[PDB]
Ligand binder design. Structure first.
Ligand SMILES: Nc1ncnc2c1ncn2[C@@H]1O[C@H](COP(=O)(O)OP(=O)(O)O)[C@@H](O)[C@H]1O
Ligand SMILES: Nc1ncnc2c1ncn2[C@@H]1O[C@H](COP(=O)(O)OP(=O)(O)O)[C@@H](O)[C@H]1O
Ligand SMILES: Nc1ncnc2c1ncn2[C@@H]1O[C@H](COP(=O)(O)OP(=O)(O)O)[C@@H](O)[C@H]1O
Ligand SMILES: Nc1ncnc2c1ncn2[C@@H]1O[C@H](COP(=O)(O)OP(=O)(O)O)[C@@H](O)[C@H]1O
Ligand SMILES: Nc1ncnc2c1ncn2[C@@H]1O[C@H](COP(=O)(O)OP(=O)(O)O)[C@@H](O)[C@H]1O
Ligand SMILES: Nc1ncnc2c1ncn2[C@@H]1O[C@H](COP(=O)(O)OP(=O)(O)O)[C@@H](O)[C@H]1O
Ligand SMILES: [Mg+2]
Ligand SMILES: [Mg+2]
Ligand SMILES: [Mg+2]
Ligand SMILES: [Mg+2]
Ligand SMILES: [Mg+2]
Ligand SMILES: [Mg+2]
Lengths: 226, 216, 216, 216, 216, 226
């Protein structure tokens, strides 16, 4: 009887039999501006606020203060849950408060330390391209992804990793090999208007819907519709 | 008079005159989430449970505890058959990897073998394109062992990820997801199948509570 | 309340809840001749004339006299506002480039910045693909300056020339030329804008005697 | 009068004015599972049985026992004709490979030759792209032997895998699988044949219990 | 108040408000045989004959005697105007090539310049991709000289052969051949044109006994 | 008043105002088996037989004896004109008879010598890919093409060069830069049948037809139709 992590996104859990199987790494993929960051933030924020599960949002796309400001526009008070120790933001430039002190191995050690310090049940790495673009050699993302996979398996948290391609499921062709779930966010062209769609392409241990579902990014975040 | 190895997948054997010809290496290809790991698990697991044939499931995609756990969602108790010595799950050194599968296959007298997946091997090499040399080395031991094997590979067009996998298989099975009208629907096709007048049609299938079923 | 920077482009602000969130880096992308330089130049120029906001226009695609003469054809007198200290035109050493932009921005207390263009920077490097490392250095100084910036890039498919520009922007505007049936017509689309419920539709626009006008 | 070598494929000779001009090197190309090995094997086998003409089948895609067992499923008894000296099966050092083919061909006075396949040679090289230099060395020995040869290559677009194979052939046969509407159906087309006014149309064919049959 | 340089091509000036803005570098792009060399010749040759403006035609595509000979097929006597010192034809050392065009342009007080073609330069480099560095060097002297220049490039989609040429031009003219129904018909389009509200329509043209004519 | 070289191909000269301008290099391009070799051979053979102009056929695609045998199937007796000195075939393995003794510079010297020895007015190089595939480095075809161009200009003969692509006009993207004429041979798909078409894409000094023309390879070679 699989334990399920509620996504935090109204309309979504019903597509995946109540939520993500505990312990799954989910690849959230889509083009620029399809809602990846938002959807990942909602997962962590709602995890903490509605379901009381601590979460770590790792970002190399922006700084922590950018994410707090941006998510405030949905009414989400990240800093409130940070002071309560239910959320940490790892950007790192700024060390998480209370957890002081591109280098891949330090990075991964530090995410592991922070997951363990708050007893995180939820984790986001936004994004894989943000990591890759910071390496000496962008194609070593291959070796970095295999190191990440090893620490995800050890930590056993429920994780969203984001990646970005416009055919291709992912940017590098590798990201999907370390994920047991895949969610696509898209903007379809019809006919002078782009509407947002989500599709669950893959989800382990789950008889998930295989249909495209409309969605909106509203004043209170993502809502998925019939 | 070719001896046939039953797939374990309802609706599938009838497409290939009763089964896989014994000793064949079969390439199982399809995009992410098209049912490859499930198909290969079903072939090993029903081999043991229903046909009493020992089998080896080699996974570099995940670990044995993940595979056991995921497969119980379909009613399949992999550990029961591991302790009876009817299934082994094998969880980068290429030559040792190969030696070890060889030894486990002999050790349990396997008749079925799965390697899930070729990309998973290749992504662990120092240079990913050395999968070419690795595949030729793997072809050589498959030929020695003479078991019935499913290798999995994954491409989005192109039949395989590297354009090489198909040169060491004598059968190819494609799993797919099609567009219709705002739903994704699953299909299987036998592209090639030595010694067999197999169907060339596309068939719908479902992945349900008892795993894969192929329809008319 | 998010504080917004008015574009200077008639018909455009209502597409983005009144203007660009202050401090945003916006990528403006489009093929040759889709109107990127004019859009950028209008943002800086109307910022100075219409709203009093000082602005820096960095160009490696042309010299400062070229841009002055060219924008005069729209009735825009750049030199007037340069003399009043409300516009600076900045006309290969990457670190010195970046330091200089930061200086000029500070010196006039700039609220607006344009860099025209990312490709024009890349093409002057020892190795073109080092734009990746250059774009990362730009990002850190944009985040430090906290001004409102337009960066242009050019491709006609792909969003950007290099596949990297979009990762340092929190807004994306696409300018396009569509064929219908004998004639190319200009369209703008807002692909991304942080903190903004923007329109997602394609709008027609034209470049006329007073620069860009976006239509319903 | 051009002397022609009868294919052994029912329905095919009439497409090429009765057969292959003697001494021609013919490239047979097609995707995985389009029937290239069967076509080649039928050319050698029916050459021996039907016309008395001795033939060499070189394969790096499988072992000799594999091809014997596989072709038995068509009622073809390769070993009978091997024992009578009318068929040789030749089952990485390029020069030694080539020398050996030339020897076996001379030893049985072969009129027919197959090499299955060009990719299977390329994939065994130290560097795959050295097939260019290998194909040039093959060409010179085919021209010396003056037998009638089929070379296979595989791509599904491009005519050949490497873009080079076609330059050492004076005939080209394409085997294909076309979708209609639920089913893959097999077609053959003669793209090129020297000294021959061949048909230029696509013909259906099937692989049945007696091998290939081409239809109107 | 922008000064305009008449094209010399009937039907074309009216598409660009009377002519090219003085000092502009114009990229003229199109596939093989779309009329580029003819268009550029016509611009230099009518410049001299009809408008009394000196011009330089730089060709690395062919030699001066070929160009004179080909152009007389259109009634154009290039040598007459070479001896009056109103046209020069310039027939690998990059820096010397550049120095030399500079000197010939000064030497005859040229107002018009053609370089036919960018690919022709690039194909003569030690490394063809150094055309990037060469183009930036050429941009620097075009900016110094301030003449009105047509550069030609050739791509089959992509606007240019290298994706770089368009970053040193402030106008782009596309010449094309379209499919209709079993004939190829010629068209011209102005993609971009600084300082000009130019037509965005596609226009048919003919290359006749008097060279290029543009139609409605 | 341009001097014109009659192509030798019935139905063709009318497309190019009576023939090729004397001295032109023409790129003959098309996919495998579209008639390139045949069309080039007809030009040389008919040049010699019908119009009395000596011709050199250079081939690295096949040997001279292969070409004589192959062209005999059209009724063309190459060896007859070879003994009369009106045609030479350069393959080279075999030196042209009477002109004794991969190396690029030797190659080009030898074609120049043979053109000059028979006072050739016609030249064929079948094919550019055949040269390129024999080089140490296939991409040096670029440098080889510029050397070829220099000797073509010096010799002033009327030349066909053949190249082979299936979008792309040529195999390498370079061949068209040394040619002042381009002819495409194609096979169009309609509807289970491939029919042959020729199109003149470019021809210097000529108001050539711009239409696709059907053609056949018949028992007496190419014939082009209305
Ligand atoms: N508060 C808001 N209200 C409504 N929509 C918003 C709001 N903030 C941002 N958006 C929308 O969400 C988008 C940002 O999505 P984002 O999650 O950053 O995409 P990605 O990470 O895929 O590039 C904006 O481009 C905008 O369309
Ligand atoms: N227990 C379940 N019940 C129904 N469907 C399931 C169940 N578990 C997994 N699936 C389906 O099977 C898919 C997993 O298939 P999988 O064999 O891993 O594909 P692949 O290896 O090609 O990526 C999931 O995406 C889901 O759709
Ligand atoms: N003064 C003008 N009046 C009307 N249209 C103009 C004027 N100047 C330029 N244009 C039009 O605007 C275009 C300029 O586009 P530009 O901003 O330079 O595009 P980009 O930077 O994307 O290449 C010209 O191609 C022309 O079509
Ligand atoms: N005994 C048989 N009877 C009928 N069909 C067969 C038989 N054996 C093989 N086939 C069919 O012929 C195919 C063999 O094709 P093959 O010659 O090996 O193709 P290729 O070399 O191009 O990959 C099999 O995929 C199958 O469809
Ligand atoms: N004197 C002529 N009369 C009519 N058309 C001609 C004449 N000379 C050349 N042409 C046409 O012009 C074409 C040459 O155009 P050109 O300017 O060289 O194109 P490009 O440089 O783009 O390859 C020839 O292909 C032919 O169609
Ligand atoms: N004597 C013949 N009679 C009729 N057609 C022939 C004859 N000889 C060859 N052909 C046709 O001509 C073709 C050969 O064309 P070829 O000039 O070698 O093409 P390419 O050099 O473009 O590959 C053959 O493929 C065949 O269709
Ligand atoms: Mg994001
Ligand atoms: Mg799998
Ligand atoms: Mg611009
Ligand atoms: Mg085969
Ligand atoms: Mg030209
Ligand atoms: Mg040929």
């Amino acid at each position: 009887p699989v334990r399920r992590v509620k996504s935090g996104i109204p309309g979504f859990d019903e597509l995946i039999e109540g939520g993500f199987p505990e312990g799954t790494t989910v690849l959230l993929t889509g083009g620029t501006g399809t809602g990846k960051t938002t959807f990942a933030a909602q997962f962590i924020y709602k995890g903490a606020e509605e379901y009381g599960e601590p979460g770590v949002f790792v970002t190399l796309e922006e700084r922590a203060r950018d994410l707090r400001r941006e998510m405030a526009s949905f009414g989400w008070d990240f800093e409130k849950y940070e002071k309560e120790g239910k959320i940490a933001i790892v950007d790192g430039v700024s060390s998480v408060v209370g957890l002081p002190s591109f280098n891949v191995d330090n990075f991964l050690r530090y995410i592991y330390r922070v997951v363990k310090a708050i007893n995180a049940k939820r984790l986001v790495i936004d994004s894989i391209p943000s990591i890759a673009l910071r390496l000496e050699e962008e194609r070593k993302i291959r070796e970095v992804l295999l190191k990440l996979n090893t620490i995800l398996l050890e930590m056993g948290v429920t994780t969203i990793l984001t990646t970005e391609a416009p055919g291709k499921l992912s940017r590098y062709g590798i990201e999907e090999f370390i994920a047991r779930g895949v969610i696509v966010l898209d903007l379809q062209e019809k006919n002078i208007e782009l509407k947002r769609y989500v599709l669950i392409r893959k989800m382990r241990e789950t008889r998930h819907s295989m249909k495209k579902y409309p969605f909106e990014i509203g004043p209170n975040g993502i809502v998925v519709y019939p």
